[PDB]
Symmetry: C2
């Protein structure tokens, strides 16, 4: 878990641009409750588009697609999957549904990760060291959660802990950890979709930042800049739908 070691984290340095990006994401989080108070009538409409786009993009990034009309039925009218592709959609759908409704009760432990992985594949016929370093980084404030969350996911993808679903699991765990710090934009704007729309950047930054990872000499700036950027696109897109402030 080279990204979450005390040595690696204590060495991280941010330029004036990154610093401003963090302050800006702090601002968006703070206004989350205002935006809602101003346009609660808009929240339902956003959720349905997000829940569908999330299941659609997260699976399509893995080459899994279903007929457009079946996507609707599986996600919105709880339909039964009839083939391998639909079974992977219903699986992500259930995992996603649980995180949106219980993330604040689900800690980042092997138990929860295995629980979510089990849902993801429920229609199909060193996590201890990751969760521990992450837990230890929070407990000691070794870095802001907007740094730990993305580095933990970088390490998760490098660790490649399950034979299948590591990419989708990384995207599901991203929502889970963001909710632990009340970064709820993921509920009204699909992060999986935002990543799929910047698909090239998503995979280039992950590969660039996972280079030299085994030696602990990897550079996380490419992945952080991309992550914070997608998180901003989500807030700006959420803002463009529920007004602004004074």
């Amino acid at each position: 878990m080279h990204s979450l070691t005390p040595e690696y984290l204590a060495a991280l340095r941010f330029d004036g641009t990154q610093a401003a990006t963090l302050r800006t994401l702090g601002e968006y989080q703070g206004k989350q409750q205002l935006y809602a108070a101003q346009s609660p009538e808009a929240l339902k409409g956003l959720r349905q588009i997000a829940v569908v786009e999330s299941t659609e993009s997260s699976n399509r990034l893995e080459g899994v697609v279903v007929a457009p009309s079946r996507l609707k039925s599986l996600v919105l009218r709880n339909a039964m999957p009839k083939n391998r592709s639909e079974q992977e959609i219903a699986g992500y759908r259930d995992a996603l549904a649980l995180i949106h409704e219980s993330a604040t009760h689900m800690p980042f432990s092997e138990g929860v990760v295995l629980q979510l992985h089990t849902l993801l594949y429920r229609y199909m016929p060193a996590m201890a060291d990751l969760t521990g370093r992450y837990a230890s980084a929070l407990d000691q404030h070794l870095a802001d959660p907007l740094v730990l969350v993305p580095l933990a996911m970088l390490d998760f993808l490098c660790i490649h802990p399950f034979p299948d679903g590591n990419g989708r699991m990384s995207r599901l765990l991203t929502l889970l950890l963001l909710y632990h710090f009340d970064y709820a934009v993921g509920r009204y704007i699909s992060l999986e979709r935002i990543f799929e729309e910047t698909k090239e950047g998503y995979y280039e930054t992950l590969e660039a930042s996972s280079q030299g990872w085994h030696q602990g000499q990897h550079d996380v700036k490419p992945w952080l800049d991309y992550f914070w950027g997608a998180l901003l696109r989500a807030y700006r897109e959420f803002e463009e739908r529920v007004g602004t402030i004074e």
Copy 2:
């Protein structure tokens, strides 16, 4: 203007702590708008305390004090000053009130700075050229977050020492002015001057520390930034404690 030079700003680097601090202040900034509308009563109560503390504390840091009963008659009843001490309390009172009501119509221009310095010495018997245009240039190009530009502009303001007298009080008044330009309105409900006075040792140790090698443009602004942000946090944390009390024991 060694702190607001593109080279000095493009060079600044922040550790994991400083980064978390900026994120935290960003969090507080964007939430006191709804935190206000949900507790209007508590505010008006804290405001009549901060306005008195701001004037009391900003002037006492300069060794200027008045009778305890006179302080309230001057600040809350616009009483007329009857000696030099009261004339400085009254001047700050007027400049402070002007900022709390027109800050968003008062850009950081030489005009606004002199307008304020003139008020500060309204009851008394009797450079900024670049600093302002340098800050303007830094904001326009986004060379740094406003939580960096503001504190560095005040460090430069104090090092320039542009007025024969008032530079200290002026820096504290200008701090509130600039913070309002970025929606950091906690200074109205929790006195930033008082928070500085309660930690005066840190206020001066960091200003003297971060101004070493200032003329050659090779000074370390971390001591001052860390102190400033820390003070701005005590203010917001203290605002959440006070609004969480006055609204539970009605």
